[PDB]
Symmetry: C2
Subunit: 251 residues, 2 copies
């Protein structure tokens, strides 16, 4: 009945520094730009067509979208940007590197934060070095004091992404529009959890590959089969083995 496509952006400049990004507006590295080019070419070779596109207000996802639309010769499509598809907000951890947080905040808190669906990191306070860069950026000036986060658990991120799905994306799908969504890991986890009916435990163990297009075949918007991946069979198998091993090593 309907076809939906998602794509997760690749490596950023702050991933090379092993630093928590969150709402900080870091750009793609050369490797992450290459990953977007490869996913665009896979869509081009298979003949995919879209009618409308959604992304966040962060340049690493917007530049991924731009690269895909260049590759498939569809730069003329309408594009809609929203803060509700941003990455999870990492609070006071924003800007710290990852071997430092265990010394700053303790091994017990690091374990809890990695394990839990509903425990937030510490808040970003006004003396934090990236407070003015993010909380006072004019792109968020139209948010209420309640909507602007100082920190987020996974449950929080999913709870602020799903109203945009429900209210803006679903009516385009029912109208027959072929939709493309270019966003981030945790905001796309929200959509996947809602579509497939996954548990909290399973969705915390699901890490999506980067730069690989994710395809859903859906009248009642229920998946006919689970997510499928577009690309060369061998390159896909290796990326999923890599992501699984990275997940297992963190426990």
């Amino acid at each position: 009945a309907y076809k939906l496509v998602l794509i997760r952006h690749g490596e950023s400049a702050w991933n090379l520094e092993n630093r928590f990004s969150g709402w900080y507006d870091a750009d793609l590295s050369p490797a992450g730009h290459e990953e977007a080019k490869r996913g665009g070419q896979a869509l081009r070779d298979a003949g995919y067509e879209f009618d409308i596109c959604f992304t966040s207000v962060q340049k690493r996802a917007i530049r991924t979208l731009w690269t895909v639309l260049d590759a498939i010769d569809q730069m003329w499509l309408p594009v809609v940007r929203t803060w509700r598809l941003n990455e999870r907000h990492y609070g006071g951890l924003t800007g710290l590197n990852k071997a430092e947080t265990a010394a700053k905040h303790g091994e017990a808190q690091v374990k809890i934060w990695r394990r839990s669906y509903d425990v937030p990191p510490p808040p970003m306070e006004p003396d934090h070095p990236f407070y003015s860069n993010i909380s006072k950026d004019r792109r968020y000036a139209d948010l209420t004091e309640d909507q602007l986060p100082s920190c987020e658990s996974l449950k929080d991120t999913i709870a602020r992404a799903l109203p945009f799905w429900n209210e803006e994306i679903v009516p385009q799908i029912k109208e027959g529009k072929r939709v493309l969504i270019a966003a981030h890991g945790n905001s796309l986890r929200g959509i996947v959890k809602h579509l497939e009916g996954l548990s909290e435990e399973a969705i915390m163990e699901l890490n999506l590959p980067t730069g690989i297009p994710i395809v859903y075949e859906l009248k009642n918007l229920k998946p006919i089969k689970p997510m499928q991946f577009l690309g060369d069979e061998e390159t896909v198998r290796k990326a999923m083995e890599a992501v699984a091993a990275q997940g297992k090593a963190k426990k």
Copy 2:
């Protein structure tokens, strides 16, 4: 507090380098035209400009110009609206011909007429034309009525289909206090300039807008300019 409006015309295209008529054919920028857009964006960055909403056409040479500018000024998050009403003039049967082939096929007298005329269109693009399916069966125009898809346009025609978008969508945004950027093409921008200044037909046919340079207007509460258009950039570029 005069309203501030900024326009930019795209630079050199791949088909300019072959001296071929483009029109509604969707040719990309050349490397030099991309470099032009980078210099225009750097001029806006150095002057500290900020925008709230952007408008452009459905053609990739204008869209890529806008993308380059937003990258240079760190405003990639702004909302963007595309419309066919801002497209370049449709050159009809001349699409794809270079100037030599045009003179050989249609003669010198008709060439003088078409170049010198405000309201005489070129020949229509018919179903045997090489580019007829490429343009007139492109799905991006599927929601136009059969009344609206051109087989050819005079300059008068182009201006007549561009101004309804200015009047019905851009003017209310300016009256709400939004800071507007428009990235488009020579002839569609000519329509906006002719309306803003009250220019005659002959005057607008003599006006040639520079490429890749920010063009700035200051407007009063009735949206009339208070002084002539000005330009942003180094001394040499601005003076030229």
